[PDB]
Each structure stands twice: as C-alpha cells, then as structure tokens.
C-alpha cells in the first residue's frame, strides 16, 4: 500500500485575521505599496 508519493511541504495555515495581516495581505493582491489613504490606517492602529 502506497505506491507513490509526491512529497510533503511546510504548510503554514492561518489561525486568525489580526489587522496587520489583513491590510498587508490586501496590498499584495494588488501588488502595490500602501495607498496614500492606507498609510493613515496603520497609524491609528499603531496609535492606539
């Protein structure tokens, strides 16, 4: 049983969302750098 394998990897699955990641993951999907408006949001979140 089990005649072949394709191997295994090092998956990292996400436990929870956490704001820094949501913003950053969001920017990547658009491949862009923080928007002029978007930068402000990090400050409030950093700010609190």
């Amino acid at each position: 049983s089990i005649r072949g394998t394709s191997g295994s990897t090092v998956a990292r699955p996400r436990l929870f969302r956490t704001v820094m990641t949501e913003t950053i993951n969001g920017i990547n999907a658009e491949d862009r750098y923080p928007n002029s408006g978007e930068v402000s949001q990090l400050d409030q979140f950093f700010g609190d």
Binding site: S1, I2, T5, G7, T9, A11, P13
Partner: protein, 161 residues
C-alpha cells in the same frame, strides 16, 4: 475504482479470457453476501453522526488533543477533524458495499500520510479514531455484517501507519 465484480472482469480482460469456473465462483461469493452489505450501509448512514460522536468520545476528546497545544484545539480544527472522520466512515461504507478496498487507495490514502506529516496531524491518534468508529459500527450492524464492515476500517488504519 473497482469493485468485487470489475476486479474479476479486468483481471480476465488483460488475459483476454472469457469468464471461466474460477471467475464465476468468485462472483457468486460476492453476490451471495450482497443483501447484507446493503442493510449494513443503511445502518451506518442513518447513524453516521452518532458513530462519530461515540468514536470521538472514546478515542479523541477529554484530552490534551483538544487542549491548547493540541491539534484539535480551536473550533476550526475540531471541525476539520470530525469532518475527516465523516470521510473515513463514508468511504469505508463505499469500500464495504463494493467489496473492494481500491477506492480507499485512490480517493483517501494516496498522499495522506505525508499531508498529515506536513500539517502536523497526529497519525496514531487518527488511527484510534478509525478503530473506535469500527468498534461502534460492529455493534450497530450485527453478526451478519460485522466482519465485512470491519476490514475496510482496518484497511484505512494500516494505510496510515
């Protein structure tokens, strides 16, 4: 996939043989147990949820597995684990109806050992979850079907270890 009957047909097809006495005897040995397989599947299907709950209760929860640091900690992972359990139960029911384990290889075991190694999923603990569902199943289905259901749970569990 293949079942009892197509296992025989393909074994003869590659030799280009019409079915002979030995073949016909094998197929009879399947047909003669067929009605019992059906009844057993209807018990498993209709008790699906209770089998998982009793199997988890005997072999998984009330433990370090469900506590912080454990692989079935978080509602997310607890859900994924009993989701898996349902797959096993459901496919074993297919294998037992077909009277052939080939579907358990094609659609369940292939790559699964390494998938579990890659995620960190505890193999030994999963086997106990399989052998606990077997225990429950063997009570519910009765003398007629107990041995026949059991083997495909045992196929599943030696496929991981």
């Amino acid at each position: 996939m293949q079942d009892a009957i197509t296992a025989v047909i393909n074994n003869y097809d590659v030799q280009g043989k019409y079915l002979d006495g030995a073949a016909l005897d094998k197929l009879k040995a399947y047909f003669t147990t067929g009605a019992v397989r059906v009844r057993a599947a209807a018990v498993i299907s209709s008790n699906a949820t209770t089998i998982i709950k009793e199997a988890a209760a005997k072999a998984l929860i009330y433990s370090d597995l469900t506590r912080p640091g454990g692989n079935m900690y978080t509602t997310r992972r607890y859900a994924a684990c009993i989701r898996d359990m349902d797959y096993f139960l459901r496919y074993a029911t297919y294998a037992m109806l077909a009277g052939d384990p080939s579907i358990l290889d094609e659609r369940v075991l292939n790559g699964l050992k390494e998938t579990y190694n890659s995620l960190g999923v505890p193999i030994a603990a999963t086997v106990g979850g399989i052998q606990a569902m077997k225990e429950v199943v063997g009570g519910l289905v009765g003398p007629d079907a107990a041995k026949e259901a059991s083997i495909y749970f045992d196929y599943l569990s030696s496929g991981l270890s």
